[PDB]
């Protein structure tokens, strides 16, 4: 079974997964599995109630979301959780009539797994939406970095700086929060390293632009050389943001 993708998902699903595995083990053990199971109608109904609620709140997200991919991917998870739930309800019925029911025991395990599995999909789907939001911020900064090439005057540069400053701060904060959430250390490191390189290069870009603007306006020698440092800085930063974008979308083999 796969490692969960973020610390949040892991803290949510890990206890459940653990109890279910415990339940499978008990089931596969003849003497304990063969004992009478008491009436599960009330706890199962409580689970169904909670599934109903989860699905109501889910459908509300569906109608009111911007993300079309979210609209597409969430409903199958609802279906999966509700279907798993009917297995639990059926098990409770069977056991009420026969505490020794074998099919009931199978439904208990299958229903539980189904709820885990579908809740997992639902969480992965919300998580992928969150990542798409981060990526949109990243992509804006990419586009804006292409605009650096047309700053010609000190007044453009102040304006550019006034905008790039915040946008970079926003991306940095988002990436810092996201990396702390990851359960894969290698991914956290790549994110941190890349974001740090981008943070380091930002005042270098501004300098390189100031130098370009100054030599452009002072009609001085070596504007061609200022152009070079400015372009390199935009290229390097962009390469690094595209690497952040690539890493934000990684799921490692132990998840699939």
């Amino acid at each position: 079974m796969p490692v969960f993708h973020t610390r949040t998902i892991e803290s949510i699903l890990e206890p459940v997964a653990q109890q279910i595995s415990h339940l499978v083990i008990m089931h596969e053990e003849g003497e304990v599995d063969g004992k009478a199971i008491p009436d599960l109608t009330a706890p199962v109904s409580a689970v169904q109630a909670a599934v109903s609620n989860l699905v109501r709140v889910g459908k509300e997200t569906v109608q009111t979301t911007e993300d079309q991919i979210l609209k597409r991917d969430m409903p199958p998870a609802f279906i999966k959780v509700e279907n798993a739930c009917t297995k639990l309800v059926r098990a409770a019925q069977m056991l009420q009539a026969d505490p020794y029911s074998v099919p009931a025991r199978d439904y208990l395990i299958d229903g539980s797994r189904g709820i885990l599995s579908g809740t997992s999909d639902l969480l992965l789907t919300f998580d992928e939406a969150e990542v798409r939001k981060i990526i949109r911020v990243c992509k804006g900064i990419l586009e804006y970095l292409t605009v650096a090439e047309v700053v010609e005057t000190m007044e453009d540069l102040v304006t550019y700086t006034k905008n790039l400053g915040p946008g970079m701060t926003k991306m940095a904060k988002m990436i810092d929060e996201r990396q702390q959430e990851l359960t894969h250390q290698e991914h956290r490191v790549m994110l941190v390293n890349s974001m740090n390189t981008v943070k380091e290069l930002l005042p270098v870009l501004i300098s390189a632009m100031k130098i370009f603007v100054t030599t452009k306006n002072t009609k001085s020698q070596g504007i061609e050389e200022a152009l070079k440092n400015r372009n390199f800085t935009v290229e390097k930063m962009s390469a690094e943001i595209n690497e952040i974008i690539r890493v934000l979308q990684l799921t490692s083999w132990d998840e699939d």
Binding site: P43, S112, I115
Partner: peptide, 26 residues
């Protein structure tokens, strides 16, 4: 309300496994 619904769902799941004696009997 989204997070509370997960909490509650996995909470009931927890209790149900307990009814099966998961971490209470066996």
């Amino acid at each position: 309300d989204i997070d509370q619904m997960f909490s509650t769902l996995l909470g009931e799941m927890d209790l149900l496994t307990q009814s099966l004696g998961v971490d209470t009997l066996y």
